[PDB]
Amino acid sequence: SPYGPEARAELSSRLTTLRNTLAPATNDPRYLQACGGEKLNRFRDIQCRRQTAVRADLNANYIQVGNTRTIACQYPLQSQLESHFRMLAENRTPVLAVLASSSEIANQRFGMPDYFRQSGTYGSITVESKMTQQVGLGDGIMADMYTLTIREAGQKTISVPVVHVGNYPDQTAVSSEVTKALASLVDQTAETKRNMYESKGSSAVADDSKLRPVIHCRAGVGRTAQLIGAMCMNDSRNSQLSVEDMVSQMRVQRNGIMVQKDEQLDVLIKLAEGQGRPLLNS
Ligand code: VO4
Question: What positions does the domain Tyrosine-protein phosphatase occupy?
């Protein structure tokens, strides 16, 4: 009964109500509004909760699901790249997971700069990209890894591991098995990098706002939310956190679209069922 169609319908009903409540009004005080005239939101209807915003000129949010702390963002606009790199560096980012595919990035109508597979200079910031590993995730899905070295006068140089799911499908959801493999790779990559900072005595270890995995697809609400949900289920600290809790938390902390598609929620439900984790709050 806990995972039956009735429970699933009730979960969707609660989440739909929340999405509606969280829909943005004009100049909504809950959502970040552009300063200085630059385009902020890649998608007009996909907004950035103001109180959890990372930077005033990015569509990007701090998210905590149970105990699990991440940043979810949109794919940065070309005009946002310097600020996006500064976000990555200041966060001492232990992994950047990019879930927009190579095909999507290559479609220049989408305006998604190839910012992590090429080197370049963006205002005051110089970035070098290097190819590292490739890890299969199942079903032919491949994670291509990179390291980004981010340099800027007056700033410590930061290297960021990148996990790019270069052949993430855009028309269909990846399975729970692929999602689990992806979450494990992203978590493991982050743990290795965080450990390096710990070993060096970085002050970022004590700061709630830093050392967060950064995750985006195109909008940062669909594939991104599926992955964040899977990651929180991997976290030993999150016993009894329900699917209702996780999705409600993502929605209140970013926007009401988090977990955009029913197919994505289906994966989270299946992962939860595998753990005996509740769907609903009693
Ligand atoms: O500026 V640190 O996060 O390497 O202490």
Answer: 1-275
Q: Which CATH superfamily is domain 1-282 in?
A: Protein tyrosine phosphatase superfamily (3.90.190.10)
Nearest residue CA, atom 2 of ligand 1? Answer: 202
For residue 270 the two structure tokens come to 């299946």
Domain ranges in the chain are 1-282
Of 64, 63, 67, 62, whose CA–CA distance to 238 is shortest?
67
Which ligand 1 atom is nearest residue 201's CA?
5
Q: Active-site positions?
A: 217
Residues 54 and 60 sit within 8 Å (Cβ to Cβ)? yes
Most ligand 1 atoms within 8 A of CB, residue of 91, 92, 194 to mutate: 92
Task: Look up residue 244 and give its two tokens.
Answer: 């209702």
210 Cα nearest atom in ligand 1: 3
Backbone φ and ψ for 102, nearest 5 degrees, come out as -60, -40
Q: Are 95 and 213 in contact (CB under 8 A)?
A: yes
Resolution (A): 1.1
Token pair 């926007």 in the structure block, residue: 255
Task: Indicate which atom in ligand 1 lies nearest the CA of residue 202.
Answer: 5
Place of tokens 């599926």: 226
Question: Which residues have any ligand 1 atom within 6 Å of their CB?
Answer: 92, 156, 202-204
Strands of the sheet containing 125-138, edge to edge, are 60-65, 68-73, 214-216, 96-98, 158-165, 141-151, 125-138, 120-122
Task: Give the method used.
Answer: X-ray
How remote is the CA of residue 204 from the centroid of ligand 1, in Å?
6
